[PDB]
Write a protein that holds these residues in place. Sequence first.
Motif, short mmCIF file in Angstrom:
data_model
loop_
_atom_site.label_atom_id
_atom_site.label_comp_id
_atom_site.label_asym_id
_atom_site.label_seq_id
_atom_site.Cartn_x
_atom_site.Cartn_y
_atom_site.Cartn_z
N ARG A 121 0.82 -1.20 0.00
CA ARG A 121 0.00 0.00 0.00
C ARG A 121 0.86 1.26 0.00
N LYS A 122 1.96 1.24 0.75
CA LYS A 122 2.86 2.39 0.76
C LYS A 122 3.58 2.55 -0.58
N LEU A 123 3.91 1.43 -1.23
CA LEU A 123 4.56 1.49 -2.54
C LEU A 123 3.64 2.09 -3.59
N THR A 124 2.35 1.72 -3.56
CA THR A 124 1.41 2.14 -4.59
C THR A 124 0.73 3.47 -4.27
N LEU A 125 1.38 4.33 -3.49
CA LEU A 125 0.80 5.63 -3.16
C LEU A 125 0.73 6.50 -4.41
N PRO A 126 -0.44 7.08 -4.73
CA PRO A 126 -0.54 7.90 -5.94
C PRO A 126 0.38 9.11 -5.95
N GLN A 127 0.69 9.67 -4.78
CA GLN A 127 1.50 10.88 -4.71
C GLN A 127 3.00 10.60 -4.76
N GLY A 128 3.42 9.35 -4.61
CA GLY A 128 4.83 9.03 -4.60
C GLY A 128 5.37 8.91 -3.18
N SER A 129 6.39 8.07 -3.02
CA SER A 129 6.94 7.78 -1.71
C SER A 129 8.40 8.19 -1.57
N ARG A 130 9.26 7.76 -2.50
CA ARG A 130 10.69 8.09 -2.53
C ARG A 130 11.44 7.35 -1.42
N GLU A 151 -1.26 -3.53 -9.68
CA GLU A 151 -1.37 -4.62 -10.65
C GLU A 151 -0.05 -4.94 -11.33
N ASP A 152 1.02 -4.20 -11.04
CA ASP A 152 2.32 -4.45 -11.66
C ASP A 152 3.36 -5.01 -10.70
N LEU A 153 3.10 -5.01 -9.39
CA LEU A 153 4.04 -5.58 -8.45
C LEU A 153 4.16 -7.08 -8.66
N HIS A 154 5.39 -7.58 -8.57
CA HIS A 154 5.69 -9.00 -8.70
C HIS A 154 6.40 -9.48 -7.45
N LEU A 155 6.03 -10.68 -6.98
CA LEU A 155 6.55 -11.24 -5.75
C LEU A 155 7.32 -12.52 -6.04
N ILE A 156 8.55 -12.59 -5.55
CA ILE A 156 9.37 -13.80 -5.62
C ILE A 156 9.53 -14.31 -4.20
N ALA A 216 -4.52 -9.46 0.35
CA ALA A 216 -3.64 -8.35 0.69
C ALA A 216 -3.47 -7.41 -0.49
N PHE A 217 -3.35 -7.97 -1.69
CA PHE A 217 -3.42 -7.20 -2.92
C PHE A 217 -4.89 -7.05 -3.32
N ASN A 218 -5.14 -6.60 -4.55
CA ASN A 218 -6.50 -6.49 -5.05
C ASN A 218 -6.88 -7.63 -6.00
N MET A 219 -5.98 -8.58 -6.23
CA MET A 219 -6.26 -9.69 -7.12
C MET A 219 -6.95 -10.83 -6.37
N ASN A 220 -7.54 -11.76 -7.14
CA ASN A 220 -8.25 -12.91 -6.58
C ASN A 220 -7.75 -14.19 -7.26
N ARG A 221 -6.65 -14.74 -6.74
CA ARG A 221 -6.16 -16.06 -7.10
C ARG A 221 -5.81 -16.20 -8.58
N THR A 222 -6.81 -16.13 -9.45
CA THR A 222 -6.59 -16.43 -10.87
C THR A 222 -5.63 -15.43 -11.50
N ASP A 223 -5.82 -14.15 -11.23
CA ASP A 223 -4.94 -13.11 -11.76
C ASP A 223 -3.78 -12.80 -10.82
N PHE A 224 -3.68 -13.50 -9.69
CA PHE A 224 -2.57 -13.32 -8.77
C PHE A 224 -1.49 -14.39 -8.93
N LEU A 225 -1.87 -15.61 -9.33
CA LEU A 225 -0.88 -16.67 -9.51
C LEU A 225 0.11 -16.33 -10.62
N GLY A 226 -0.29 -15.49 -11.57
CA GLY A 226 0.62 -15.03 -12.60
C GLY A 226 1.52 -13.89 -12.18
N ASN A 227 1.38 -13.41 -10.95
CA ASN A 227 2.22 -12.33 -10.43
C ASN A 227 3.14 -12.79 -9.31
N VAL A 228 3.32 -14.10 -9.14
CA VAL A 228 4.17 -14.65 -8.09
C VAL A 228 5.05 -15.74 -8.68
#
Lengths: 50, 435
Positions: free
Chosen positions: B217-226, B240-245, B262-274
């Motif tokens: 949530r802190k990473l995806t802040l619209p205003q930026g984090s730095r 939707e672009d974060l990837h987890l290893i 924890a993210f906004n995905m639901n299994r089907t579209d999340f398994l492709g991001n891990v």
Amino acid sequence: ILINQTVQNDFITSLVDRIGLVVIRQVSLNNPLKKFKKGQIPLGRTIEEI
Amino acid sequence: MRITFNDVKTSLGITESYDIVNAIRNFKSYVPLATANNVAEVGAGILINQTVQNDFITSLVDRIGLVVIRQVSLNNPLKKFKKGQIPLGRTIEEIYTDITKEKQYDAEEAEQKVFEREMPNVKTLFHERNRQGFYHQTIQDDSLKTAFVSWGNFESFVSSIINAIYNSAEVDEYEYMKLLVDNYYSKGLFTTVKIDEPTSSTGALTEFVKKMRATARKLTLPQGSRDWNSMAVRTRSYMEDLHLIIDADLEAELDVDVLAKAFNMNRTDFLGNVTVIDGFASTGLEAVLVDKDWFMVYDNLHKMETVRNPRGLYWNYYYHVWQTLSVSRFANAVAFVSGDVPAVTQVIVSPNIAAVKQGGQQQFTAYVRATNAKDHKVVWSVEGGSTGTAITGDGLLSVSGNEDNQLTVKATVDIGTEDKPKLVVGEAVVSIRPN
């Protein structure tokens, strides 16, 4: 310069220099005594002079 | 890893048997050109003599295998990090424009300066790593003679000669990705988040999950984090672009759900991001969360070459794959470590490399990646060696006249004790131009 080095620019320090042209030097060497060559012997080994 | 004739039939624009080999191609009056049910005739035509046999096997293996393997390697699950051929004149330089606020509209302020520039584009260099290797295999004359009994034997033979190389390359890709992640972590360019043994108990698991959710949530802040990224440049990431290893044991202990909640995905579209790997083999690294554009891979070339041993009656075909891997210094990348990481990880100087005149000034600011809530003090040093070249405690450095040497500004933080054999420093390269 014998070896290229990373040159720090005065506007951006995060980029490097790029090669804009590559030139290949070509020279041909001869032998001035070639005028004294005889022919070829495809068969046999020895030559006899009388 | 179980490539069959269907995969090659989809990759190529052909149906079952073909004569494109003897279309590209004397060879003409040796084999029949019909694609009928007959196989004995084509087998005899291929095996009539060694010249035709070798030419056919070379054309088949080289061209068909290369095309099929190149087509199938581009559709593996980890294909979103794969780019095409390396572009010409890439210059290995990465330029990012830092985002800032606006300037108030004022005619009196605008009339004095209209040609003034704005700010340097904080250039940096790509972090590269190249690989080059080969796999190779052998095929016997016996299991080419015993392959023309029926049209199914031929396709089974083709699938068999492709499958080994394909599966070996696919397996090695994951290992190379893990090696790159390990090298990046050892370099210390990640931003670290402390956890406490998620697999030890149940409370640690949910604490780790909550920490991961808060970090995303802190990473995806619209205003930026730095706060993240190897250099503080104020970039913003995407849900939707974060990837987890993640480690194999950790993901086995965890479940498919709630992790995706924890993210906004639901299994089907999340398994492709891990991505799942068996152990990080780096101290106590557990899971690495990076941006999508953080890691890219280009392919220099893929080639297949055949040679024949006539004394032993066989063929050897070598598959060479050369490619390079690049990790960007601007994308967000979080380490999520559970170990004995120090209080301070790295200190970053914002101006990076700068150029100044013989009598100019420059402001340097430092960001400290502290894993705890305690604030640390940063001391500034100039090194170099000259007269009048000194930097204040707030990071303002003025350059004295008549200077020739190249100097580097250093920001140092101490986290030790009375005996302090531990120093973390950040270096900024300052060049001088005559005035």
